[PDB]
Design a protein around this ligand. Structure first.
Ligand SMILES: NC1=NCN([C@H]2C[C@H](O)[C@@H](COP(=O)(O)OP(=O)(O)OP(=O)(O)O)O2)C(=O)N1
Ligand SMILES: NC1=NCN([C@H]2C[C@H](O)[C@@H](COP(=O)(O)OP(=O)(O)OP(=O)(O)O)O2)C(=O)N1
Ligand SMILES: NC1=NCN([C@H]2C[C@H](O)[C@@H](COP(=O)(O)OP(=O)(O)OP(=O)(O)O)O2)C(=O)N1
Ligand SMILES: NC1=NCN([C@H]2C[C@H](O)[C@@H](COP(=O)(O)OP(=O)(O)OP(=O)(O)O)O2)C(=O)N1
Ligand SMILES: [Mg+2]
Ligand SMILES: [Mg+2]
Ligand SMILES: [Mg+2]
Ligand SMILES: [Mg+2]
Lengths: 481, 481, 481, 480
């Protein structure tokens, strides 16, 4: 038996071992062909038609490259063909649990539709994996290639979700600790999933990627850090790591949190809410699930994809009128309208428990201005976006180990002051976007007065356009002028 | 009134006129987001997730580039804003008629489901364009921006499908003849649709593009050729024009006619045929249409997209069983198996009316070999692919006009023997691929012996691997050495 | 007369007006073919073989794109073909005054050869432009295309060096003020020269570019600011402008100030100092000049290119032995050895008058360790590098104007707090690199100890590898751990 | 420890320290001062790249191909030692290039030294010898497990072929396939091409059609006529025809560009007029000329693109003629392109005839009234042989393939098994004519002689023939 070759525009010709092919050629993996990587970003960036499927191949490919690289350079690590496959499998499978429109589903749909449940795509990836394995006769095929399903299935799932329950992992011991850093690096977020999506999202969005993962791979080594074996970067490359998270943040600003992309994701989510009662997805034993409950049964979830959008769009059932009308207004580009953007100030930190209350606050504002129409809470959306370097307030580069040229086996720490003064002083912040559902000229004018008035009242930053959109309101606030 | 900017990975930041934006923001154009450009090719090239929507924006942009370039260099042509917009609209809309999986629908499915009808995506584009214009109050918007609907609608349709019936066109006179060479060039095939898909398909497939469309635009001029003002290429660019069609042929060979890609298209088509009695598509006044009759009402056709594939795959209806199973086999990768490729020799052409007879002819071969199983006509698929330079046996470069540096207004002609001896002798050929529906080790062995024997019997070329797949058959034929 | 097309790998097919062709085809322009853009950088990045010539074509191209784009969108500015040509010429001739190995020459060599005189490549470009025009008969050709020599030459020089002495410019009035911001923007540094070197350097270096100059041009508008017409960016592009300076700093970190690149430049400069007396360059009327004095006569400077490197390398005269040995060490790669890098803490900064004393300070450190050799001051090279966003301590985005979508003719200001808390808190810093001229294991061992001890004594930052290269030294300083 | 180098084409390349010692010599570093495409840079301003970085990439790619063969097929017994000798050959096959690359051994040496037979390959072998001996590389080689007696011979043989029956001494015939990596004499499918396709394209602003990585992935070693050879996958045969189509296309667009070539020619004339006056020092202190530097490697080491500027900046009265030609280049006062034509039917122009062609053009008698009469010396006639690397032969007839169902069995694939759309011929000649007199009247005359001459010889009708010579082309019925 020989390898399958697959051509990918990002990575070129990738070789896939027959076990990986077996996993890929299943309904549970192929499902990822019908889930757009960037959700509603396709409706803003017309090149972003790419799906989770090809992203997963790439992650699997890169996990293999990193593990081979480490193995060829340091044979004393005892990296086995078995470890390589298990890392490739984890990389292939870490995106299995995504739902329709990727981050729209667990980021917006599930939290509103079922506020009580605790669901992430990572948890889904682990459940969908198990389902893939059992439904498809994968265990014997693993054994055929030297894998041991008892330990290795555990290893794979641990790589995706972390500790399943003082070394906390059963899949592998502390001397393979570095394997846990490849696919999903819980310590600092420097992993191959980022490296595929940087290169791949840039290719499709029409933005260029400034981070060189192949250079990182050539400089990476394993060293003993606090009695674990860990992946270490070369000292003088610390600048590139900082830039890696800078790039992540700027891809979030330019594309992933695009103000129209997010409002499209919001309109899609609203339509899913209105359709949730009347759509049925046949699960295991012929049982019936909703869009919001297909997450409890992997056989139903298997069939939950972006197709839901077009089920609703093309439906004739009058119970779906409301859902269908909202999708129709997306097609006509009759979208909820962007009013503006602001941030908090000092150490105001807007908590999740207060998200529901923000539209009422905006409608409660009392601008000293004569207004033709008057707007209510229902007429406002307030979207709160938590921008960070992947570790809330923490600097992930403080959780990175390095080595120097003169003694490559010796791990060292590097602080922000040892690198540059031109680096960020904070590593997290919030943006607040405000939109109005009432879109004629007179409503939009009013929305802008209320909005800027509210920014004034809450001591938020002056919107960039504030003097233009609300010249009677911005003189009131001393901090602004 | 301002231009929308859109960012395209192929062309960068494209500007859209408000009238173009009102056309794009309709159900009839937006449906092109759910039709893959390369149909089944996504299932072989994982980067080829792109859809018809982004290709159409590009054709529209490049149509505008070529018409602006001509207008700037040659003001005497009297090219107006109005002409520019109609060329852009024809370019944006020339792909409106595509069905599910693009060329699969009009090249595999409709010929087999509706043999009696003359259907092309071109004729669909015109029907869909009229439906788009009437359904969305576009005629007053055209008038708002200085177009004259009865004249300009005719012009737009003529650019897409040719004369609607001296000078055969009603929309513009012969002094504007060159404008009909931009979006769909019936004389020699050199047009902006090709240029967009060379660049876009190559970006997504992972095969680099070798044709430079920007260089062609820099050198393009309008000259008088037999009493019409036509587009002329610079003399010493003739070589790049030959390379253009060489590139087109190369992409057909590597990607568009990939042997697995074509058989996935075949399987899907099969699923669609078995499903066609049962799928209802709701059209005008709530009447119901079939997949095969959606082409008869544009309201229904508006809703006929790649969605149909997943409607079938996720159906529970027992009546859709056989269709659903074929699509499920695609997911497991249990595909009909490729047996080999051959071509006709000498004078033999194979006409479209002989296609049905071929699986029978393969089944009737009598290979002199020990064969465990016996295969019937219904076990074989025979795909006949007509490969050419866009004009059957004709050299399209014989239908291009050139100018020289010393007399830029004087059109000339250039023959093949004035360019190079390293150019093709013929400009059309046929490939014949044979596949087997039974996929076991023994049926496949038999399939190979029938196929190679059939090749020998019909005097076709020796398959490349023929001495390996049937070592006992290929000795018999002296022509094969 | 028609346009020359040139194919550039960065911009594609650029059209050049016949006047521009005439300026280009002179010894004074063609000179730039023999001057490497990145100096000694090619000896580290083997892709960086590019010369100032192609970069100059690119700057002129982009200068025309920006002026044409402003003209098309805003006809009310009265941009004439005259203005376009002059801006293009200023763009082409901006780099005429570079010397051998570009920034090496005016950044290292001239300051050490002729400490008293003050020479910049900007003034060199103005003096070389004049000599180009005068020696080649360009004035009459200017007039043949409707330029007015006395106004327009003044305008061209002014766009390069700024005012030649309260509206300070003679070449154009205040109502064309925006034209002074295209080629060399003295207010904030946002200009087309950067845009060309970002794309070009990246293409050659093998590092990818994050900045989209074409997006910036699409969003640019001229608006009234303090009673001046200025170029304004769209408000919500403010983040991209910050990203632009971030990309510049990043290229300086990775490439332009590479530690080995800089030392090669330093070694080359040392060879030129040793050669300076003996190399003769013939200027106006057979007067003889040195490498250091060819900047006084433009006929000599025309003949001063990277060729100097090879004339020294290939020489056999005993007078040049010392120069020739240093260049031979470059070939053998027996370079001065990098010791390490630190930065100053607090807001101490090292003034340019202290730079000479710094090698003596390093030799005067007394690390408490067995050293087999003592090093003297002349064994050390100390390279101090100012990193900023182009305006020393200042935020150049404070000197940029913006407009918003609701009133596109109203200029506004945006402050750093209106953008992001993730931005740099400072805009300038110093790097200090230390190298040793004695390269054997013992001397380098000692240099590391002198070095780290000198960092400790001065309260500079702990070198990243300090614990590894000087473990007997770093324990003394409590703050380091 | 490896050194890492960032190349824009290939990315981060790892160099074994033995490679680094070869590279860090005067003999290898001189390749920094020799442009890959010669006078091409004077037409394509992106093509500033030199032979140095091309050499690195051929070295990297030779390494990639041998490694990949070793990993896929351990039964070939490819050792670390074999990998290093193949990387060195790859690295060193360009060492013998002279100023402006193909200008030097294509134009200047054949005119200045017609007596001698000289190629850049021979020069790469002589330069490699000098590199080794001048820099103490033999003991460094021993230190990494190489054996200089055998391994120097193997490296040389990889560049130049056999140095006089299995013809090779550097390796036995079980390692036959290793001779097919750096410079493949059987069919021209080697890594030198792959690097230049990608590199030249990147700098020229033309996009490359060929996927070398895909080729490496599908490559295998099989036995073919009692010899191990690199074989390709059967279905990749179309890609191989494409590779040669790409090569020809790059020749047409860039390497034989009508002005690039005429700049090479002018530079070549400059070097001919300077040859008596430039002196370059060699071993034992002996002086050599531009034309005789090839006889002494210590002198040849100092002979690079710098000679062009030494001539351009010179003050010596004796160099004035050579200096003026180079100054004509700066001012863009070039010899003028007149046109292009080809022979017809079986006609083939012989290399002994090239000299006489300008006499033929000047001796033509166009029926047109002319102000100027032009002599033989006013014309340059450039004959360019365009092929698929093997004169009239199809290189894909010399490639071995394997199919999926029997990967160890070599097969042959004929052109009719592939496509009817492929070339029927694999070689042709282009004839370009230029005039050294550049005034409008001379150029108009040059055009009438040229088209008359094409008509006399029954060559192809130039493409612009009815426009440039409307009074000459109606005489020829074959043309209309
Ligand atoms: N010339 C060419 N053909 C295919 N191709 C892409 C498609 C796919 O991503 C990858 C492997 O395709 P290939 O056709 O080699 O594989 P297949 O499985 O059909 O053939 P087999 O080896 O089983 O006969 O490359 C590609 O980029 N270029
Ligand atoms: N930083 C960045 N933003 C957007 N963008 C892409 C997306 C889209 O194809 C094109 C225009 O987006 P923009 O955000 O400018 O338009 P929008 O309509 O949302 O803003 P408006 O002008 O209405 O306020 O650019 C892009 O590539 N990079
Ligand atoms: N096929 C091809 N040829 C040239 N070329 C590049 C080189 C050069 O930068 C630009 C213009 O070259 P061209 O050959 O068109 O100009 P030339 O001046 O020799 O021809 P003329 O028009 O005077 O006859 O394009 C290019 O990319 N591809
Ligand atoms: N950030 C960055 N730096 C360098 N670089 C390029 C230059 C060069 O071709 C290759 C290796 O450079 P590096 O700086 O890593 O090596 P050097 O020999 O100086 O460091 P050492 O390891 O000896 O300390 O990469 C690169 O692309 N990006
Ligand atoms: Mg296959
Ligand atoms: Mg908008
Ligand atoms: Mg020309
Ligand atoms: Mg180093």
């Amino acid at each position: 038996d020989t390898m399958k070759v697959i051509n990918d525009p990002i990575h070129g010709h990738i070789e896939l071992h027959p076990l990986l092919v077996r996993i890929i050629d299943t309904p549970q993996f192929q499902r990822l062909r019908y889930i757009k990587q960037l959700g509603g970003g396709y409706y803003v960036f017309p090149g972003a038609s790419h799906n989770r499927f090809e992203h997963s191949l790439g992650v699997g490919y890169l996990a293999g490259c990193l593990v081979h690289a480490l193995g060829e350079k340091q044979p004393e690590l005892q990296i086995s063909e078995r470890d390589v496959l298990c890392v490739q499998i984890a990389g292939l499978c870490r995106n299995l649990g995504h739902g329709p429109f990727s981050h729209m589903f667990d980021g917006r749909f599930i939290p509103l539709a079922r506020p009580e449940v605790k669901w992430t795509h990572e948890q889904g990836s682990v459940m969908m994996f198990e389902h893939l394995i059992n439904s498809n006769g994968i265990k014997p095929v693993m054994e055929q290639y030297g894998l041991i399903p008892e330990e290795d299935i555990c290893f794979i799932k641990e790589q995706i979700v972390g500790p399943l329950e003082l070394w906390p992992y059963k899949g592998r011991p502390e001397n393979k600790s570095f394997l846990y850093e490849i696919v999903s690096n819980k310590r600092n977020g420097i992993d191959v999933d980022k490296w595929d999506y940087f290169a791949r999202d840039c290719h499709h969005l029409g933005i260029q990627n400034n981070f060189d993962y192949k250079r990182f791979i050539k400089f990476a080594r394993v060293c003993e850090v606090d009695n674990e074996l860990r992946i270490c970067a070369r000292d003088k490359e610390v600048g590139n790591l900082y830039d890696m998270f800078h790039t992540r943040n700027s891809l979030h600003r330019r594309a992933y949190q695009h103000k129209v992309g997010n409002i499209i994701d919001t309109m899609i989510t609203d339509a899913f809410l209105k359709a949730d009662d009347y759509i049925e997805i046949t699960g295991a034993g012929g049982k019936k699930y909703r869009i919001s409950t297909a997450i409890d049964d992997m056989e139903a979830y298997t069939k939950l994809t972006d197709n839901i959008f077009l089920e609703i769009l093309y439906s004739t059932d009058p119970k779906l009128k409301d859902a269908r009308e909202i999708l129709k207004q997306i097609e006509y580009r009759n979208l909820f309208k962007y009013v503006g953007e602001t941030q908090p100030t000092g150490q105001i930190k807007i908590k999740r428990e207060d998200y529901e209350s923000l539209p009422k606050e905006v409608a409660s504002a009392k601008p000293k201005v004569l207004l033709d129409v008057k707007l209510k809470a229902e007429d406002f959306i307030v979207d709160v976006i938590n921008m960070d370097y992947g570790m809330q307030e923490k600097n992930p580069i403080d959780h990175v180990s390095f080595y120097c040229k003169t003694a490559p086996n010796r791990a060292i720490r590097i602080t922000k002051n040892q690198v540059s003064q031109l680096l960020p002083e904070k590593f997290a912040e919030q943006l607040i976007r405000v939109y109005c559902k009432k879109v004629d000229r007179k409503s939009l004018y009013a929305a802008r007065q209320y909005f800027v008035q509210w920014c004034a009242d809450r001591n938020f930053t002056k919107p960039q356009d504030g003097d233009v959109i609300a010249p009677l309101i911005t003189p009131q606030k001393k901090e602004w002028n």
